[PDB]
């Protein structure tokens, strides 16, 4: 209790908050799905509605600390107000997305942090081909708001999409599931542009 | 009135606040689900909507006091803002849950909390065979979002869910409804989850 | 201006906020509800729509003042976050409750509060036969969620729901309406529940 | 800029907030509706759904200031959180109000306010005989929440609802519309109520 | 870090708050419509849903910074709360317009600014004719709320909407899509009102 309560205190309360990374100190940030359902399909629209974990990893300085000065204290949770994350954003999206999970990180004493949302997405999708065999296939993009390749690197920790929570018996059947990170130049703006492609081939059971 | 006033004082705002079990200090909570409607079925999603209570229990230190030095003030009423509540989350939740009750909780003078949530969830389910006699069983887990069985212990009081509550004209009729603990690990991280599997059968009303 | 700002600020800023009821110093609240539309019926789910203005009244001591040494001042208007409000909650509802108005109270300094929210409510009603002439009949419960009878007592002005802001072109037509005070225990608890039954008996409008 | 930053701040950070009219001090609201698209009505409920503009014009001297002290500054505007706003609300509404403008208000040296908010209501409405040529006519009150005529005094400028900014193509055609003070007393309460109602027969465009 | 953390304590905290523009002292404000999708149509109600990125760009002096004294940094990141922003608005919309996007801009040593927030739209159109092969055409003005051409000017970089983010397999194809300012006075009040009229021509 009173351990951690200090140690909460020294890093929220005595700093000024951090202002997020710049071209000098860049930072890298690591995602991660793991598909859940694909709830529904809709071919009046183009939007597809997918539910997943989105995992967040990044680590930040003003985060560190010595686990013997502070009860032997190797990690703590915190609401993710309590700290800055990431602007991760779906690019196609049609609708806000909903959080079904608690706003809440997981801070480690050498200043890594972990943060998993759960979520209900809405994208655009032409689903036509999901009843024949072959399937049909979708993407989306998920790539900082407001920041280049200079100031936020993604990457995933692999290609393949974690479908181990996948429900059994969803309407959809995945055949596959890839998340690849990806550069851009646009015609816009001079800096490149990361983003990591999230990418499901899929069709109805049967 | 000014008894109760100094006992709230005390407890929150002359502590830090309760930061959460550690493994260390772990901590144990129990849940206990009252089915009430199943209100709707969608086939084209496998979704179900279910309403209930969720009973959660737990007990902290934090929150003793002596009824003596308070007025025998034996147990408080207090909005679940101004405490620690466990992260307690249905895993296979399509939407998010909406809430049907007030926030508040009940404290009582050796420290257990009682806090009882009315509920409306969208889960994951493939309903076909409602129709059928037999039924069809659907399930969900409900486990903490971020702490682990070696943080927070769930526990059920009771492998029956209690249908006392659940409404007389349901469109559908339980048959069966489990609350059951588990331990699970996950390829992702090292340590072992706890969680409540809550299962329930059932099938369109008839006779 | 000046004077009600003294007010506020001697009733606000220098106490603590009335932390609510005890089995000591219970507390007794009056409802009254003023039907309004019956909007929605829907046969596939059994949930009812029903929109209505729900009066509360209770009386606080930590509320009084002499109007005297206060500009001569009755009563007051105030944000309804700036006082304890009772937790009344709809015991069979399927979907949270969409406030309709400001949330806003009136005290007096008698420390009576009257506080009236215009809610749409989703409940639980089977309501097949609504197309025939005897019509159908549904219920609900209105409660506290976590206190007793030893710490609220309810109860109605009168037996009649006041359905004199009811819709005249409404899809549906009122034949009963009823808000009755009820006492029950349960298996669960020692103490004693108070709930005002809400009962409406209903039908499709004719010509 | 640093002339109107002076104003707002001697006007809100530098008093306690205006704390709404009593019976001593009362004050009278003005409203003005313009209607814009009557998108959908439900013969399932009688609901009617209905997108408008609401013009509130108030008075205050809490508000006034001298454009000679403050840069010859006649007006300006500000979020309609910095201020007190009146409670005007639709007595038939079955699903909450939604917003469709900013939340800004226009304060003019004389202590006037302007506050204009767009908005969607959903109320109360037997729509049968739409189809008809005759039409179909629909009322709802506006009206203070929890102030009296004692406190507060409705107004019309105008007993035509201003019909200029109505879509051409909605699919109803709007044949009368009128906004009319009232005055009530109700079973329960000493005081008259004033509220301004809303009239409005329309019907299927051909 | 450090350097960041005090060049914005020098803006925000240590002076009041931008509050707006003035007839004074004018504020131009510049459009740029990123279409997207159009998602739905709705025949029983002439509402059409669509869902683009609306770049908007203004410039301040008191946002202005020399780089030299705050670590040569020329450009930050910040909630769109920190600072004022204008509050343009869809005329004709039938619905909250529901945001897609964080809600961060992005400030310059110069003083400009740029914010471009995502959004799904659902406005006024009759769609009737959008599987015939010509099409149908909609538009949407896009107005400050509360300001008039005195006090902010909008004006497009471009009368093409871009349309390079466009949806491949969008249940409609985008015939034509234009961006253009409009003045109009009214005759009971002196001043000119601006706006960004939203045009875009579409079918199946
Ligand atoms: O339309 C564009 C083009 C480009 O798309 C790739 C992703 C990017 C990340 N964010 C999302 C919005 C965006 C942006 C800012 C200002 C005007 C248009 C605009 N976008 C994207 C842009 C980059 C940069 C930025
Ligand atoms: O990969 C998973 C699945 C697994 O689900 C069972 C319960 C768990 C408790 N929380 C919920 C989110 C979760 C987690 C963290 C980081 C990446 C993915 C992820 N999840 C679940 C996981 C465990 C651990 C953790
Ligand atoms: O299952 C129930 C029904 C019973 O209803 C009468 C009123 C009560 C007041 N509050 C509202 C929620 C409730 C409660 C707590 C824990 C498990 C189940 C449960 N409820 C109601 C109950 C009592 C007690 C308590
Ligand atoms: O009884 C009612 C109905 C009536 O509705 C028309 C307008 C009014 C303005 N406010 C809204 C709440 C209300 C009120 C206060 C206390 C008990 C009942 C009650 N309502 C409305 C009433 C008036 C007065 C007041
Ligand atoms: O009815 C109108 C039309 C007119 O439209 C051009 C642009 C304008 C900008 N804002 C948006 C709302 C509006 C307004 C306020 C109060 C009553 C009517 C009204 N509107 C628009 C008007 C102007 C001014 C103002």
Same mark, same amino acid.
């Given at each position: 209790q009173a351990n951690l309560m200090r140690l909460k205190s020294d890093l929220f309360?005595?700093?000024?908050? !951090?202002?997020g990374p710049t071209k000098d100190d860049p930072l890298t940030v690591t995602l991660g799905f793991f598909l859940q359902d694909i709830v529904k399909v809709d071919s009046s629209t183009n939007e597809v509605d997918l539910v997943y974990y989105e995992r967040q990893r990044w680590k930040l300085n003003s985060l560190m600390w010595d686990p013997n000065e502070y009860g032997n204290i190797t990690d703590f949770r915190t609401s993710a107000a309590d700290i800055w994350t990431p602007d991760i954003?779906?690019?196609?999206?049609?609708?806000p997305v909903q959080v079904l999970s608690p706003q809440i990180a997981v801070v480690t004493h050498d200043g890594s942090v972990m943060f998993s949302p759960a979520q209900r997405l809405s994208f655009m999708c032409d689903?036509?081909?999901?009843?024949?065999?072959?399937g049909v296939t979708c993407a989306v993009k998920f790539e900082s708001?407001? !920041?280049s390749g200079f100031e936020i690197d993604l990457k995933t920790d692999t290609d393949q999409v974690d479908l181990?929570? !996948? !429900?059994?018996?969803?309407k959809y059947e995945i055949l596959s599931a890839t998340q690849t990170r990806q550069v851009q130049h646009y015609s816009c703006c001079p800096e490149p542009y990361i983003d990591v492609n999230l990418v499901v081939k899929f069709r109805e059971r049967r």
């Open positions: 309360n005595r700093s000024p908050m !951090y202002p954003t779906a690019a196609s999206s049609t609708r689903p036509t081909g999901v009843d024949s065999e072959e708001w407001v !920041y181990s929570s !996948y !429900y059994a018996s969803s």
